[PDB]
From TrEMBL, chain E:
Short name of one Pfam family: S1
Lineage: Eukaryota, Metazoa, Chordata, Craniata, Vertebrata
SUPFAM superfamilies per record: N-terminal, heterodimerisation domain of RBP7 (RpoE), Nucleic acid-binding proteins
One of the record's GO molecular function terms: nucleic acid binding
Free-text function comment from the UniProt entry: DNA-dependent RNA polymerase which catalyzes the transcription of DNA into RNA using the four ribonucleoside triphosphates as substrates. Core component of RNA polymerase II (Pol II), a DNA-dependent RNA polymerase which synthesizes mRNA precursors and many functional non-coding RNAs using the four ribonucleoside triphosphates as substrates. Pol II is the central component of the basal RNA polymerase II transcription machinery. It is composed of mobile elements that move relative to each other. POLR2G/RPB7 is part of a subcomplex with POLR2D/RPB4 that binds to a pocket formed by POLR2A/RPB1, POLR2B/RPB2 and POLR2F/RPABC2 at the base of the clamp element.
Stated name of the protein: DNA-directed RNA polymerase subunit
GO-annotated biological processes: DNA-templated transcription initiation
Organism name: Sus scrofa (Pig)
SMART domains: S1
First-listed, main subcellular location of the protein, grouped into a coarse class: nucleus
Family of the protein in this entry: Belongs to the eukaryotic RPB7/RPC8 RNA polymerase subunit family.
Subcellular location: Nucleus
InterPro entries listed in its UniProt record: NA-bd_OB-fold, RNA_pol_Rpb7-like_N_sf, Rpb7-like, Rpb7-like_N, S1_domain
Record's GO cellular component terms: DNA-directed RNA polymerase complex; nucleus
Length: 88, 134, 192, 112, 171, 241, 31
């Protein structure tokens, strides 16, 4: 029951974040942020600081996580260790 | 124009069907009530049947009158929602009220500004010339 | 430059009902106070070796001070499809300085007929509806005295489209349909 | 527009009248002693006339509608003037507030 | 007559429409062309109540398009020869009478009009009236006309109105 | 049987007379102030400035229901909203009238903040801004921090810049719906008046570019804020002196 | 006895239309 509920709510959160990203692309940002790859229930890649005027931000769900907490992954750069900023 | 022709046709059909129906339902009540000779069916059936029939036709007439009232109200709403010339005249009239209000407010504010500015000038000529000298 | 085609639908309103049409147009059109323009137009024709004389229409706004004369060329009708239900003509619109009359006469264009048009202008999107009463002008040169060509007023719906894509006529037909009970705006061929 | 108001009033009145007439006529129909003979005929005539009148009025008012039942919802609004006036009133209120505050400070000065 | 029948129609779907929502795209597209077009064999088509089934898509070699045979249920209206149908008069003219039956429009020639009937040019609204005024036909009136025959062109059907048959015209 | 019939008839008629002798009057009054239209049986109205030339893709259609009548506001236009502009030195009316005025005000504040946030993100400007969710932060002078925030209640502040924001977006609407676009010569096509005058009364590059200028609500607001700060600074300096 | 007509006040005259357009295009009644 916990595994099914967790998978469902995490996929719903992925969908909500994807809708928020497309809404931001539509109105305010306007090509200043892009969607590289979006896999429903697997990962969603957002690219900022484009080459015109690249980096990606992947938000994924892994079946069930017990040994390691499931957080977000900044895949391309792997940002440096900034104690205050990387935590936020 | 097509869509205006269709709206007119629908309202007119509502009204025509309506006068015809109220008159015909009254006619059916009178084709009836007329205590005619009975046979075979028997009053025990004829009587109750006739009573029920009269009740139902009365209800029908009342419903047709209610529909007439509804259509009248609809026409009234249409003549206030989008008559067109009256609506244009009303928009022009509200523009008038708003404009006069704005004018009055503007004049008031300008006069206020002038008087306050004169007071400010007096105070600027004072405070600056004060001996004091901490 | 791309060419500018003018889509035109022309219809007439008798004077008695002018008030009803004015109120109606104000409601459907964008909420702008009516223009109430007055203008004088003289058409110049060039009698060259080719039989057809080039016709250039020169317009001066008497009512609006400090506004330039407008010179326009109107092409032959390009109407083809019955579905379009519009008159299509090539049009070039050029604002000109006051010394327009002299330049045209020296060039060789000859003044032919002059009319004075007075009426109201209203607009919805690109569409412009002009309602005006044409007045004949008598005496060789002047605008002081005019006689009415007709009791009725011509109503013309005109769009100066860029000539890119189409369906411009469809929008015009829909708008014309609303005024159709009040006045039948239709494409009337200039011939007879 | 009072014309439309009067029309509606007349309509309602006539309708109510006709249904009262019908009620009375059917009540006299069940009546064992219908004393209102000529009176009853007069009532029938009146009811018929009323219905005819209602019908005519309705048709004429429908045309009055369809003369300008343009279907078009009408664009022209007073939103511009209204918004402008609202802005002006708010500005005057702000000015009044500032004036009152300055007056209060001056009062304070006097209070010593 | 209003007849609810199943039609066999084909859809040419551009590949750009492939991907998500391809099946309802065909359903959505089907309504675009079927509605607004008529055919003599089936008459005017009003609406598609439902889609019975969706067929397999066949590509056309070289073209790249797809062929979807779709079975759908729709109501159609077709005039039949020698039948009487209620009609509405649109415009009244001396030459003939123009009447509209929904999508279908019918023209009545002056010859088909009864001999005793005559055009009323003097009256501001064009109309036909008799000497005794027993029966009057005017624009936007209910009349019944007998269809002499069904004739079609450019996906449009318009027949002739015959008033010779008994119990026809306004009442 | 006729007794029953008569009874029913009388009851109904008298019921109609009891419903006859102010929904109608209410609806009439609601029309003069707020534009209305007829669709189906759910009569709607306009609650947007689209008549006054606003290019905001939002349907301002408020419903009218019999409950002597009630106005149904579109969802997300409810509550009260007011834009707040602040400088930090770091870094009577009818029932439905109040509801419809508040929802229209919320719509205009959303229009303003959409304009401001888009101009902050996309238009390249000196000393760029940060738009987080509902808050724009700019640094016009290096010791100065200006903050524009859309406070949506959903049930230090300078009023002058908020009021000027409303008037700026109001002039930006009225530029489209202007009478300057009307051509008094009937033959003349359309467009601005001085752009017509540019032809015969020959204009240079500078007048042509001054008639058709590109800037933005954000740019103008920042300029105004900077001027205010400078004035305040000079005043304080002279006072100390 | 539902009478017959009620409003036949024609808004536009087609002859007028023809005349006006004719003048505007060629120039009848202007030279």
């Amino acid at each position: 029951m916990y595994n099914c509920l967790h998978s469902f709510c995490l996929s719903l959160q992925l969908e909500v974040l994807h809708s928020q990203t497309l809404m931001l692309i539509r109105e305010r940002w306007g090509d200043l942020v892009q969607v590289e790859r979006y896999h429903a229930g697997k990962c969603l890649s957002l690219s900022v600081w484009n080459q015109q005027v690249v980096h990606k931000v992947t938000i994924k769900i892994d079946e069930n996580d017990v040994s390691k907490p499931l957080q977000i992954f900044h895949d391309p750069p792997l940002p440096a260790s900034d104690s205050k900023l990387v935590e936020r | 124009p097509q869509s205006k022709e269709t709206l007119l046709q629908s309202y007119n059909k509502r009204l025509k069907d309506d006068i015809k129906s109220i008159m015909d339902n009254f006619t059916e009540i009178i084709k009836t009530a007329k205590i005619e000779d009975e046979t075979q069916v028997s009053r025990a059936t004829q009587g109750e049947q006739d009573n029920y029939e009269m009740h139902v036709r009365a209800a029908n007439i009342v419903r047709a009158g209610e529909s007439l009232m509804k259509l009248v109200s609809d026409l009234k709403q249409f003549l206030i929602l989008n008559d067109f010339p009256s609506v244009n005249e009303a928009i022009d009239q509200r523009n008038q009220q708003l404009r006069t209000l704005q004018e009055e407010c503007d004049r008031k504010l300008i006069t206020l500004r002038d008087e306050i500015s004169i007071d400010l000038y007096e105070l600027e000529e004072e405070y600056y010339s004060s001996s004091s000298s901490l | 430059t791309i060419n500018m085609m003018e889509y035109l639908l022309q219809g007439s309103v008798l004077d008695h009902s002018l008030e009803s049409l004015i109120h109606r147009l104000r409601g459907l059109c964008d909420n702008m106070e009516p223009e109430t323009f007055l203008d004088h137009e003289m058409v110049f024709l060039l009698k060259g070796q080719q039989a057809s004389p080039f016709v250039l229409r020169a317009r001066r706004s008497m009512d609006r001070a400090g506004a330039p004369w407008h010179l326009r060329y109107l092409g032959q009708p390009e109407m083809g499809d019955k579905n379009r239900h519009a008159l299509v003509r090539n049009c070039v619109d050029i604002a000109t300085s006051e010394n327009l009359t002299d330049f045209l006469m020296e060039m060789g264009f000859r003044m032919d007929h002059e009319f004075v048009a007075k009426g109201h202008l209203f607009r919805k999107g690109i569409m412009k509806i002009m309602v005006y009463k044409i007045f004949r002008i008598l005496v060789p040169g002047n605008t002081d005295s005019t006689e009415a060509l007709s009791l009725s007023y011509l109503v013309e719906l005109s769009v100066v489209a860029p000539a890119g894509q189409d369906m411009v006529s469809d929008d015009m037909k829909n708008f014309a349909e609303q005024l159709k009970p009040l006045v039948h705006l239709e494409k009337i061929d200039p011939k007879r | 527009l009072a014309n439309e108001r009067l029309r509606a009033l007349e309509d309602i009145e006539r309708e109510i009248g006709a249904i009262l007439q019908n009620a009375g006529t059917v009540i006299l129909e069940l009546s064992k002693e219908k004393t209102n003979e000529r009176l009853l005929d007069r009532q029938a005539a009146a009811f018929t006339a009323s219905v005819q009148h209602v019908e005519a009025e309705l048709s004429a008012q429908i045309r009055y509608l369809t003369q300008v039942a343009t279907g078009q919802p009408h664009e022209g609004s007073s939103y511009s003037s209204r918004k402008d006036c609202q802005m002006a009133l708010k500005r005057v209120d702000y000015a009044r507030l500032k004036l009152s505050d300055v007056a209060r400070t001056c009062e304070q000065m006097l209070e010593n | 007559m209003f007849y609810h029948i199943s039609l066999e129609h084909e859809i040419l779907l551009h590949p750009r429409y492939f991907g998500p929502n391809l099946l309802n795209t065909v359903k959505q597209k089907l309504f675009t062309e079927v509605e607004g077009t008529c055919t003599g064999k089936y008459g005017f088509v009003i609406a598609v109540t439902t889609i019975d089934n969706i067929g397999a898509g066949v590509i056309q070699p070289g073209r790249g398009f797809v062929l979807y045979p779709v079975k759908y249920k729709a109501i159609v209206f077709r005039p039949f020869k020698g039948e009487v149908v209620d009609a509405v008069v649109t415009q009244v003219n001396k030459v003939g009478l123009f009447t509209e039956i929904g999508p279908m429009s019918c023209f009545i020639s002056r010859h088909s009009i009864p001999s005793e009937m005559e055009f009323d040019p003097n009256s501001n609204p064009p109309c036909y009236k008799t000497m005794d005024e027993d029966i009057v036909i005017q624009q936007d009136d209910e009349i019944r006309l007998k269809i002499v025959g069904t004739r079609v062109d450019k996906n449009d059907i318009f027949a002739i109105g015959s008033l010779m048959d008994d119990y026809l015209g306004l009442v | 049987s006729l007794a029953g019939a008569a009874q029913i008839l009388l009851k109904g008629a008298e019921r109609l007379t009891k419903s006859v002798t102010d929904f109608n009057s209410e609806l009439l009054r609601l029309r003069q102030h707020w534009k209305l239209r007829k669709v189906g049986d759910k009569i709607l109205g306009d609650l947007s400035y689209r008549s006054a030339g606003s290019l905001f893709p939002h349907h301002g259609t408020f419903e009218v229901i019999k409950n002597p009548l009630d106005v149904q506001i579109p969802s997300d236009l409810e509550g009260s909203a007011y834009i707040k502009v602040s400088i930090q030195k770091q870094a009577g009316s009818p029932h439905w009238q109040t509801k419809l005025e508040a929802a229209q005000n919320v719509l205009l504040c959303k229009e303003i903040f959409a304009q401001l946030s888009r101009e902050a993100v996309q238009i390249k400007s000196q000393v760029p801004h940060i738009v987080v969710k509902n808050q724009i932060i700019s640094q016009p002078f290096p010791s100065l921090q200006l903050s524009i925030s859309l406070c949506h209640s959903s049930n230090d502040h300078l009023y002058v810049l908020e009021h000027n924001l409303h008037l700026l977006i109001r002039e930006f609407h009225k530029q489209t719906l202007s009478s300057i676009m009307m051509p008094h010569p009937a033959s003349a096509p359309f467009g601005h008046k001085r752009m017509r005058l540019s032809g015969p009364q020959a204009f240079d590059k500078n007048e042509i570019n001054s008639l058709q200028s590109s800037e933005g609500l954000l740019e103008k607001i920042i300029k105004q804020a900077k001027h205010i700060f400078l004035r305040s600074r000079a005043a304080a300096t002279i006072d100390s002196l | 006895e539902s009478g017959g007509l009620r409003p036949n006040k024609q808004t536009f005259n087609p002859t007028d239309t023809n005349a006006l357009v004719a003048a505007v295009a060629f120039g009848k009644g202007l030279s």
